[PDB]
Amino acid sequence: SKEYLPDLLLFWQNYEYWITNIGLYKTKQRDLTRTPANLDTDTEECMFWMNYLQKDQSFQLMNFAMENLGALYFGSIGDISELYLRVEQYWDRRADKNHSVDGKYWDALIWSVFTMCIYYMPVEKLAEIFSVYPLHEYLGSNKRLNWEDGMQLVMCQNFARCSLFQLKQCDFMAHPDIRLVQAYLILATTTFPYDEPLLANSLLTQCIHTFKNFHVDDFRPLLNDDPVESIAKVTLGRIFYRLCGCDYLQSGPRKPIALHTEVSSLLVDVYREENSTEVLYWKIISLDRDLDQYLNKSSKPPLKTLDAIRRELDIFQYKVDSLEEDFRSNNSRFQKFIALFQISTVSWKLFKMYLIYYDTADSLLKVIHYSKVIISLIVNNFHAKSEFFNRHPMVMQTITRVVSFISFYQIFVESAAVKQLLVDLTELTANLPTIFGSKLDKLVYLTERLSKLKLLWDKVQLLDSGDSFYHPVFKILQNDIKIIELKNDEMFSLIKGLGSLVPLDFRTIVEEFQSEYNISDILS
Template sequence: MSSSAGSRTSKKACAVCTKRKVKCDRQIPCSNCIRRGQESECIKAVTNDFIQNPELGSGKDSSLNILRLWQSYEYWISDIGLFKTKNIDITERLPSMEAQLAECSFWTDYIKLEDSFKLLNFAVENLGPLYFGSLGDISELFVQLETYWSRRQQFKETPDALLFSIDDYYWNSLLWAIFSMCVYYMPLDDISESFEVQPICEQLGIEENQQWSESLQLTLVQGFTKCSLHFLQQADYGRNPDVRFIQSFLILSTTNFQLSDCFLRDTLLAQCAHIARFFNIDSYKQLATDDESTDLSKEVFSKIWMSMCIQDYQQESPTKNNSFHKEIPSLLQHAAFYQDMPNFDIYKQEDSFESLCWKITSLERDLDRYLLTSFKPQIKTFDAIKRELSIFEKKIGNVNFEKKSINSQFEKFISTFLLSTIYWKLHKMYFIYFDTADSLQLSVHYLQLMVHLIETNMNHGLTFFNKHPLIIRSLSRMVPFYAFYNIFESNPQIEELNNDLGNLILALPILLGEKCVKLSYLVQRLNSMKIIWEKVRVEGTSSNWNHPVLKIIQDDIKIISRYCNRTLILVKGVPSFGDATDTINDETEENDKEYFARNKESSEFKFIVNEFEKQHSIISLFS
């Protein structure tokens, strides 16, 4: 660790809040500055010490100090901007209700009885870790599938005389959620053997001589997902709560559904939370007074709640603050206590796969809380997280891929990939905050380990494992980080790694959706910043902090944070709202002018920034 590492962090409130003499939450940017539209000033508060001290703004220390900005950039751009922000076009024309019903009718007629049982068998044999935990009895699915086809036959014979019950619609939704999951993960060869492509081509109005492709498979997944959601609507879930609503949501969340529509996903999760409270699913702790059936139910409740907490944490954003995963305290609060107990086995296997995944994810939560704070974390906190990760690494153990079932292999892959993701985040933060020995190389090591896991799946004919949403979520943090680092530091290994990761993104399955395209755009955008960083030098200063690239990075954070915290004007012509908004915009513009003037930034400087932001708009991430 360099001698100046301890002096890089300030625990003071931001400059704007200090000047206004108000309490600051010390996030980057803080909530006060977001409300007033002064994000630029707030972000610069983190770097003002280095701008004023040229000695800390040059050489290796400059690169390390600039990397502190990555923490905010990772949160606002790689997480919020890429996955949790969407620009809604309210002028877009929607299909009529009749058209939507006709589309669902097409998909329900498209699938045949024999094909549906093939899908269910595929789910049981290959996709167990994704949904076994949320169901009480897997064998009941086969019974309900037979009942589903009986209902369909009766409906064909007497369409006007039969009225489906709420229970029927909920089972329909659950079954179609499983169908969606199956066609999402099923290899393309298996899809082509089970399903005809011609009816889909006719429905889409494209050439009928098309062969099965990932694009058509994605259409199949989206169509089946619409059917599952359609049946939930028919069950009138707002009035008729049922645990199968949660089960359907959790199953759909194992597909690209959680990547495609952040608002719908958040709405359904909020409804899941209400239903879980209604049925006391969150009260899963077993009591001595519970009978055998209650014990079994609570065991399933525990798995459902852990899965919900993972989804809740992954969906947390500035526009979604009512997060129930926070009710479960940090694992670190009890870790030291348990390790000191004489007869407690810290390596005891977890009660369930869902519990294991949640506990590992909770360590990610402990790390991510430093993304938006100016506080420098204590190294002992990182060391404690590292100890916990080593315990989970031993719990997962070494599983022989050749001798275990596909379900076991999938379970091993998910848990190992998740664990490696947290290890990567840990060493990335060791590097950023403490510049510890080999921390950068260790981050590269765990990234390469995850790439190796992906390649192993391909070599063993298990490519469908790589479609799990965890893959794109993890890579969205890692790949941009090395592109960001490559801007400011010349390192042949990182530059080569950056190129390889760019190719890896292009090779990801199309089924992951447009997020791969957006991630590739983000990486290309960062690579374009490197060109400006190398070619542009600002005269009259010895500090790299007065550079157009730093201004672009700060603007990116400002744009995303402001969009997420925007205020909707409901009444036109009301002075208090309109004038306040104009004042904020004017004040922000004036602050930017003062910033340019204070640092003697020329018109050429501003031209470079403006041209880059026009050609590489950050809004393209969520438009």
């Protein structure tokens, strides 16, 4: 065993919050002077994608969304048949010079569905719908590239840019509308916010501002409410919780405005009045908020919240199993997978907190058991015609936290059970879908950097000069936190914008680690 192991595990919480939660996704720094601002004729690239679609191509695209992508567009209007009228109206007028603000908003929402649908669409179905030839004749990073060579990634990004371009033409700041929120929630299912955290963080602020402008405190219809407006109020209640769920996932130092002011499940916002399917999804997210709020805080969580969540988590397992599952309908199967994955993820978080703080017995075994079922869920759907089920952004966050913690625990404590789990865990990363792109590649670098950090751990003999033990492994680990700490800080950026001043033995083995390991590729 080891003496200071309990104190070493407490430091891991800070490492997880900065390296994986913020450093991997939430941060992106681009110098304004080097980056050129968009100008006129710079939208011609998006204009090339406007006429790329044809009359027949997009209709079959919507046919795929209505069959297998049911669980994701409930943040928009629930019925998809009524969207067929809007897409027909969008093609009804295309050569008419005159444009209406009300008409322009519908076009933005329609293009948002196309971006979401094509991101979850399998590669084999995309081959017969679109032609790869006449698109790279204009521009392209590679002269010849197939659909498997990261092609679906570059095409999805351009559609998202065109969706935001239409909103810019409408001047959405001048004319707030409910369709601004509905369009953004559809794009939230795509990995677009991860690529541009700065753009998505401030765009969500407009959605928060637009939603709060309605001044609808209670979504329950009243006796005196008109029949027409009663259905609107219950519809608006769905948007509020879906927005709150997507708001928490973007929470960080860059976003200072938060909408999730609800009271957690205890024993002063509005809560405990409805139990719709969208509310149930947010309830699982609220449970994760209680555990994840202690990452930055030094104080240990109370043992009741660690115990009350355990009682609450058992109830939710009965509800997801009570929902009927139909093999013919993929909408019920996709909803089942999402709910099952969220419950298992929270259980892994809960028992991890048991091991770090209080060190209860049979807690390490539960973490291994709960991590194994996570592997099974990804493996099981991959076997039988559900290869696109793994493209949801939630599985990327779960994989990062289970890969890093297991590797971090393995380099310090050697166990046969933990070692056997790592080799299967690593193999799962290589089989993950390629639609993630850059974020997937950085995952391999992070786990590989910690992989042979163990080799340095046992190569250098432990030296003690006092009660607190010192080692070169610890200095580099704390240095990694500090490097990302300064980049996330915008204090020095004030000097850039205000004033003419520029913004602000043992060492030998440490610098060797830093010279050949450089995690500071986040800006790229």
